[PDB]
Design a protein around this ligand. Sequence first.
Ligand SMILES: *[C@@H]1O[C@H](CO)[C@@H](O[C@@H]2O[C@H](CO)[C@@H](O[C@@H]3O[C@H](CO[C@H]4O[C@H](CO)[C@@H](O)[C@H](O)[C@@H]4O)[C@@H](O)[C@H](O[C@H]4O[C@H](CO)[C@@H](O)[C@H](O)[C@@H]4O)[C@@H]3O)[C@H](O)[C@H]2NC(C)=O)[C@H](O)[C@H]1NC(C)=O
Ligand SMILES: *[C@@H]1O[C@H](CO)[C@@H](O[C@@H]2O[C@H](CO)[C@@H](O[C@@H]3O[C@H](CO[C@H]4O[C@H](CO)[C@@H](O)[C@H](O)[C@@H]4O)[C@@H](O)[C@H](O[C@H]4O[C@H](CO)[C@@H](O)[C@H](O)[C@@H]4O)[C@@H]3O)[C@H](O)[C@H]2NC(C)=O)[C@H](O)[C@H]1NC(C)=O
Lengths: 209, 209
Amino acid sequence: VSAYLSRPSPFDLFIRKSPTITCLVVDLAPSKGTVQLTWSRASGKPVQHSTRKEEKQRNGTLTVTSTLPVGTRDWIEGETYQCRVTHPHLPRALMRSTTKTSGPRAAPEVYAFATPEWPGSRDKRTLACLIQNFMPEDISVQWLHNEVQLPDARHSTTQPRKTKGSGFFVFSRLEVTRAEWEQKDEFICRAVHEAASPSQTVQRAVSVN
Amino acid sequence: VSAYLSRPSPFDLFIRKSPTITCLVVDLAPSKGTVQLTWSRASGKPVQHSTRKEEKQRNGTLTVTSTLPVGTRDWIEGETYQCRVTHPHLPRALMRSTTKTSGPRAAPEVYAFATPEWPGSRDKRTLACLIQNFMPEDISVQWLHNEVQLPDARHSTTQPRKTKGSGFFVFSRLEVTRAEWEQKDEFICRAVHEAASPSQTVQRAVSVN
Ligand SMILES: *[C@@H]1O[C@H](CO)[C@@H](O[C@@H]2O[C@H](CO)[C@@H](O[C@@H]3O[C@H](CO[C@H]4O[C@H](CO)[C@@H](O)[C@H](O)[C@@H]4O)[C@@H](O)[C@H](O[C@H]4O[C@H](CO)[C@@H](O)[C@H](O)[C@@H]4O)[C@@H]3O)[C@H](O)[C@H]2NC(C)=O)[C@H](O)[C@H]1NC(C)=O
Ligand SMILES: *[C@@H]1O[C@H](CO)[C@@H](O[C@@H]2O[C@H](CO)[C@@H](O[C@@H]3O[C@H](CO[C@H]4O[C@H](CO)[C@@H](O)[C@H](O)[C@@H]4O)[C@@H](O)[C@H](O[C@H]4O[C@H](CO)[C@@H](O)[C@H](O)[C@@H]4O)[C@@H]3O)[C@H](O)[C@H]2NC(C)=O)[C@H](O)[C@H]1NC(C)=O
């Protein structure tokens, strides 16, 4: 029986200003009892109503995830949120807590690229974004075009991996069509990160030329 | 407990022409008694002598691995190798099999990029490589300078993800130093793939400039 507690996405925190936290509970061998997920703050202030979802998996195990809406100001000013997990036939109560980092920070470096022509695909182009040397690993990536954010499904971002020096890197990939760049030849890759200043974002544009 | 069985890397398979497979056994509860890893083929032909290895991790976990060398021709022609795992404290043994993935083939497209100078850090640059539109997902990636292969610890390659089409993509990152590019400002990103004509390889060169 595992219990994980994740922090809000930077996008939800700093752009949409509606953060949430998710308490994920994985139970290898469940008795199908009533696992209770109670939320609480360190200050004693009340918590908003949380969503809950249970799902049986193919490998014979139940996952319970509860998502708790959190206040923007509250998180940014350093509130500690706790997920208490309880089950009748379980030795003790698992307790996971989360809060905004007070350890080392580093803004990300962003670099945007556009692939050259490849024989037999002159209408297609792949744009790629390197984002590196940032910490913590919490980061959100968006692609913009005509000053407008494209749907998330359009692009693909890799999992945060450690760099050799310090911090993390991720790559983001976005396929684009001739129509797009001929309409306007400028695509922005934007990273959202708490260590970034002054507004928690760092973005870079690239063109197909 | 959980067991994993990998396939041979394209490099070992096609370039060194001495492929091996590994049966990894992760034991979260190190109990007394020797764990058994027995090898076999689907055809029922003799397997070569394998290598057993044991080591305890920092998180109180035991890691036992057995590596079996396999034949080049044998693997390509579609042999299935098999690893039967037997722990002292378990009734039914765990079995894992591996074999050459079979589907349509596609050659990889390689693209290689160099970052511009980031404020402050002038004595180093990051090189990026995008390798996309290939299948199956198996692919080796290596960096070279002066026709000399750099150590694997120097670069970092992401796990193969699905593209919007029908192929897979992978990124690879390598930090270089001022002493290296001033000696010879050219770096090769080389990918080894089954469908990579003409000699199982595709590469592309890049410069810091
Ligand atoms: C039967 O099958 C189910 C799934 O079908 C298995 O359930 C999975 O269990 C694993 C671990 O037991 C879960 O993995 C954990 O995910 C956490 C959340 O992060 C993931 O999800 C977010 C967003 O969804 C992604 O952004 C992120 O990249 C991850 O993919 C991680 O936090 C967990 O730990 C990892 O991160 C921490 C740092 O916080 C590290 O310290 C850890 O080392 C580790 O890297 C972990 O990865 C997984 O989510 C479960 N899947 C589902 C669908 O719920 C059962 O375990 C399996 N049963 C058996 C017996 O095998
Ligand atoms: C205590 O700490 C140890 C490490 O010190 C942890 O051991 C690791 O456990 C995880 C989970 O089993 C292992 O991760 C698995 O890796 C497999 C592939 O191995 C890669 O890395 C090795 C390098 O040793 C390479 O040789 C290999 O080629 C790979 O690059 C994956 O196959 C496993 O599953 C993943 O892939 C499959 C696809 O087939 C997916 O289905 C899965 O979803 C998943 O993505 C898995 O990721 C890891 O290998 C172990 N490390 C070591 C050093 O042995 C213990 O787990 C940890 N204890 C606890 C309780 O967490």
